[PDB]
């Protein structure tokens, strides 16, 4: 937890594809809410994007892990979530 949360802090400025990929590798290292964080991190994965990185991390994973409607809780989020239904397929 501390790691996942520290790898994603707004303090970690140069956070790149590898910082999140490893902040999604440290989920099998748990033993509380899994899929709350799964979102917390994919979301700061976009704040840093300044609507490239979301792009790559979906390129690094290789999928019904990620959420959606729950997420927006927007023009290229769905737009990348279409060539993400073609990729997984």
Q: Which residues here bind other proteins, judged by CB under 8 A?
A: 35, 38-43, 46, 54-56, 58-59, 61-89
Expressed in angstroms, the distance from the first to the final Cα of the chain is: 32
DSSP output for 27-79 = TSS----HHHHHHHHHHHHHHTT---HHHHHHHH---TTS-SHHHH---SHHH
């Amino acid at each position: 937890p501390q790691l996942i949360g520290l790898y994603i802090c707004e303090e970690n400025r140069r956070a790149n594809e590898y910082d999140f990929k490893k902040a999604l590798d440290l989920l099998e290292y748990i033993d509380i809410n899994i899929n709350d964080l799964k979102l917390e991190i994919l979301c700061k994965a976009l704040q840093r994007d300044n609507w490239v990185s979301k792009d790559s991390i979906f390129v690094k994973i290789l999928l019904p892990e990620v959420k959606d409607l729950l997420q927006a809780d927007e023009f290229v989020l769905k737009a990348n979530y279409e060539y993400y239904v073609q990729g997984q397929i």
